[PDB]
Amino acid sequence: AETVFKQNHAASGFLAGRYDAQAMSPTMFNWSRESRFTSTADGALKWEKNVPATPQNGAGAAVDGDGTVFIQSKDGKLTAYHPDGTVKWVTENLGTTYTLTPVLGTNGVIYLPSHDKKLYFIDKETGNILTSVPLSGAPSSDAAIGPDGTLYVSTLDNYIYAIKPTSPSTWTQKWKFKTNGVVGSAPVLASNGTLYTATYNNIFYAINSGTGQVKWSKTTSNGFKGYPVIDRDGTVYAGNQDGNLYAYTSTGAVKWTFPLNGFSSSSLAIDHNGNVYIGSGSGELFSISKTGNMNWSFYTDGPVRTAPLIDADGNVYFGSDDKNVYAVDADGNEKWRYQTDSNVISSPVLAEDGTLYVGTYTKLLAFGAK
Numbered sequence: 001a002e003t004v005f006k007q008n009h010a011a012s013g014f015l016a017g018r019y020d021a022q023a024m025s026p027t028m029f030n031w032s033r034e035s036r037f038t039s040t041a042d043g044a045l046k047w048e049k050n051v052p053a054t055p056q057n058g059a060g061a062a063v064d065g066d067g068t069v070f071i072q073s074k075d076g077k078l079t080a081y082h083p084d085g086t087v088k089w090v091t092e093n094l095g096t097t098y099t100l101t102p103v104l105g106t107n108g109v110i111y112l113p114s115h116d117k118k119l120y121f122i123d124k125e126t127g128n129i130l131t132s133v134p135l136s137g138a139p140s141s142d143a144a145i146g147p148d149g150t151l152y153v154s155t156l157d158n159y160i161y162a163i164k165p166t167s168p169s170t171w172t173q174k175w176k177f178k179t180n181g182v183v184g185s186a187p188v189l190a191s192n193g194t195l196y197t198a199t200y201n202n203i204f205y206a207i208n209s210g211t212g213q214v215k216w217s218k219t220t221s222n223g224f225k226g227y228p229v230i231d232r233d234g235t236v237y238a239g240n241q242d243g244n245l246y247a248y249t250s251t252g253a254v255k256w257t258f259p260l261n262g263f264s265s266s267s268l269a270i271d272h273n274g275n276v277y278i279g280s281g282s283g284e285l286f287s288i289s290k291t292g293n294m295n296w297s298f299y300t301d302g303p304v305r306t307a308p309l310i311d312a313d314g315n316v317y318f319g320s321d322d323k324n325v326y327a328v329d330a331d332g333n334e335k336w337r338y339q340t341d342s343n344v345i346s347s348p349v350l351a352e353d354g355t356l357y358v359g360t361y362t363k364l365l366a367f368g369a370k
């Protein structure tokens with residue numbers, strides 16, 4: 001890519017970690033989700049592929065510096081597509097049933113937690129397995145990557161694991177944290193070193209990412225779900241199943257809450273002006289200011305489960321259980337929609353040339369530049 005991938009812009013505060021900086025889109029979460037790319041995509045479909053998947057919390061494709069598109073399917077395949085939709089490679093017999101983002105790290109390594117209770121290290125050039133890490137339970141998050149390359153995942157047996165790769169073929173366990181409750185809020189990391197996660201026992205955790213010790217915790221009446229975003233102040237914005245977005249300061253004070261009219265249904269984005277974006281079971285996609293006032297909302301006919309993606313012009317792309325892909329401008333006005341035949345739940349991704357990828361339970365869709 002001609003410019004480097006950065007997790008942060010001037011208004012976000014993720015802990016900078018060892019993602020592939022030459023990739024177009026190396027991670028779905030643990031970053032602002034404001035793309036550095038512009039797009040002239042107008043809703044015309046460039047191509048579609050059959051990719052059966054059940055992505056956890058809006059997981060989906062990653063795109064490297066060549067524009068190669070990597071995506072897991074629930075038949076146990078990881079597939080690398082060329083930009084024109086032809087297949088570059090396929091690796092089989094990985095996990096089934098639920099899918100996760102094939103996150104692109106340094107040294108051309110793909111980090112793919114898998115439902116077979118393994119965290120695979122995979123060569124992105126060939127798809128060959130470099131090694132795998134046994135997990136005590138099936139993973140429930142994408143791999144977040146820290147500054148020293150440590151991988152942070154939640155697992156379904158109520159753990160956060162910190163696994164440190166020591167080369168493309170070797171690894172050691174940094175720490176593990178047994179959580180009180182099923183993890184619904186996947187690990188994301190903030191610039192002061194804190195890892196944030198939360199459970200359906202209503203506990204929101206701030207954890208020292210180096211040591212695995214809890215710095216502080218807060219409680220609510222229902223569980224947080226998905227991937228929070230973090231601003232430059234270290235404030236964490238997390239969607240709650242009680243129907244509110246919560247903003248926690250870096251000390252654990254409640255900065256504010258905002259009503260979503262339904263259970264939170266997507267993970268978040270944050271733009272360089274500090275506005276945060278989230279989908280609701282109400283069908284709405286919200287834009288909310290850093291002080292917690294509504295900028296706008298856009299109404300779809302079903303829960304919005306894609307984490308929205310902002311482009312460099314402030315347009316916002318997302319999908320709905322009403323089976324439409326959506327594009328709106330920075331003021332919330334519709335640009336275009338595209339009707340597909342499956343709920344749109346696999347979050348959007350932007351290539352350097354403006355191609356937009358987004359997925360359903362059955363297909364990967366590519367929307368081309370105009």
Ligand SMILES: [Cl-]
Pocket residue numbers: 001022
């Ligand atoms: Cl380069």
Ligand SMILES: [Cl-]
Pocket residue numbers: 217218219
């Ligand atoms: Cl509290």
